[PDB]
Amino acid sequence: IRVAEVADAGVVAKLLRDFNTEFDTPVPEGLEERFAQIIAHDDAFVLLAGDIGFAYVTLRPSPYYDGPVAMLDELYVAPAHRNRGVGTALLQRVFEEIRKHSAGELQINVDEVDTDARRFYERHGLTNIEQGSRMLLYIREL
Amino acid sequence: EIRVAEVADAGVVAKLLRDFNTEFDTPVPEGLEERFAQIIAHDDAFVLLAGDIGFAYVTLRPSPYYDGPVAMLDELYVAPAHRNRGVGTALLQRVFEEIRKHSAGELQINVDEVDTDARRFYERHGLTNIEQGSRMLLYIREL
Ligand SMILES: CC(C)(COP(=O)(O)OP(=O)(O)OC[C@H]1O[C@@H](n2cnc3c(N)ncnc32)[C@H](O)[C@@H]1OP(=O)(O)O)[C@@H](O)C(=O)NCCC(=O)NCCS
Ligand SMILES: CC(C)(COP(=O)(O)OP(=O)(O)OC[C@H]1O[C@@H](n2cnc3c(N)ncnc32)[C@H](O)[C@@H]1OP(=O)(O)O)[C@@H](O)C(=O)NCCC(=O)NCCS
Ligand SMILES: NC[C@H]1O[C@H](O[C@H]2[C@H](O)[C@@H](O[C@H]3O[C@H](CO)[C@@H](O)[C@H](N)[C@H]3O)[C@H](N)C[C@@H]2N)[C@H](N)C[C@@H]1O
């Protein structure tokens, strides 16, 4: 696993394209050019497991912590390479990398029906319960 | 009325967040004012203030899905004695207005399932918990 460089924007864009296609979710135009800009800056990073898996992490400020709040905005391993520990290794490296940023928390948006992903996340120390209540994510696309 | 907070307003914002956390029996971390002063001054974030009775804290972060950022309404609060009079609605409308200046492609809000009044508020104002026929859950690990 490596932190992506700007030179990796093309492979990151390919993997997100494959991800969204697999899940019948639209593929934005211009992914490679945006990833090249995003990777060049310090409020986000991408981890690559060779060319077959990736984690996209954003950082944003919080008044609760000197460091940022981290969000795992995308986690994906190519279908032929799943169930071999790649995703586990990616997530562990997420924690290691955000720790270098003194991140106070990791947050992940997860669809409720994705029970296999939820089992993976809960196995690795993420929780959806806060004081007996589930935490919900509400959005408005603009 | 509602204004974008300046660095000098950090103390007002910290007070409101303290009151917010005190209302819901949540620990109030130290250094709130000093951190809000830095966040307001330097970071990709902003605070909206309704007088000194309410605020919205919004962060902006990168997205490959569009040119602009994805916005997160990380805190929204109206003092108890001033609720149910449209202040919260006014703050949220101004949130949409300000993030539109940043060409934000999406607004996201984390809401506890048991906060039914807050959920009805967000749902009444164009936010949805449903994506592809499924609820969206927020998973965390505190570090
Ligand atoms: C979820 C995912 C990143 C995990 O990576 P991985 O390399 O397959 O995971 P690991 O080998 O380290 O651990 C296996 C766990 O991953 C989960 N998993 C495996 N395949 C999965 C799949 N198609 N979809 C969802 N979860 C899967 C399971 O929980 C599995 O645990 P199990 O042994 O109890 O069945 C990967 O499977 C994937 O990309 N799935 C589809 C996209 C997705 O769900 N991303 C989650 C972001 S919200
Ligand atoms: C949620 C909140 C920001 C809305 O501000 P507001 O000025 O009361 O809202 P408005 O007057 O514009 O609209 C009224 C709606 O606000 C909601 N509301 C009122 N009091 C509320 C309360 N204690 N908690 C949650 N929502 C409340 C209700 O949905 C109400 O609609 P209703 O008349 O059908 O019951 C404010 O009530 C509040 O600070 N609540 C406690 C903190 C909170 O829950 N924040 C939500 C972030 S997840
Ligand atoms: N079912 C798995 C999904 O994983 C990823 O979404 C990741 C997105 O972060 C989550 O979606 C959120 O993030 C994306 C991108 O910002 C927005 O398009 C979307 N409206 C917003 O809800 C999303 N709800 C879960 C996942 N963590 C894939 N991009 C799509 C795939 O369907």
Numbering used by the authors:
A (entry chain B): 7 to 148
B (entry chain A): 6 to 148
Give the authors' words:
The primary mode of resistance to aminoglycoside antibiotics is through chemical modification catalyzed by aminoglycoside-modifying enzymes. Here we present the first structural and functional studies of two aminoglycoside-modifying enzymes that do not use target mimicry, AAC(3)-Ia and AAC(3)-XIa. X-ray diffraction studies reveal that these enzymes bind aminoglycoside antibiotics in a conformation where the central 2-deoxystreptamine ring is in boat conformation. Similar to other AACs, AAC(3)-Ia and AAC(3)-XIa display the GNAT superfamily fold.
In contrast, all five structures of AAC(3)-XIa contain both protomers of the physiological dimer in the asymmetric unit. Despite a tenfold molar excess of antibiotic to enzyme during crystallization, electron density maps of AAC(3)-XIa only allowed for the positioning of one aminoglycoside per physiological dimer. The experimental maps of the antibiotics in all AAC(3)-Ia and AAC(3)-XIa ternary complex structures presented in this report unambiguously place the aminoglycosides’ central ring in a boat conformation rather than the canonical chair conformation. Additionally, in all of these aminoglycosides the N-3, O-4 and O-5 atoms of the central ring were positioned in an axial plane rather than an equatorial plane, positioning the prime ring of aminoglycoside around 90° to the central ring. The shape of the pockets rationalizes these enzymes’ preference for 4,6-disubstituted aminoglycosides, as any hexose substituent at O-5 would provoke steric hindrance. In the AAC(3)-Ia and AAC(3)-XIa complexes, regions of the adjacent protomer in the swapped dimer contribute to the aminoglycoside binding sites. In the AAC(3)-XIa structure, the swapped dimer regions are folded closer to the aminoglycoside, creating a more enclosed pocket than is observed in AAC(3)-Ia. In AAC(3)-Ia, the aminoglycoside site is opened and easy for ligands to access, whereas in AAC(3)-XIa, the aminoglycoside binding site is closed off and the enzyme would require a conformational shift to accept reactants and release products.
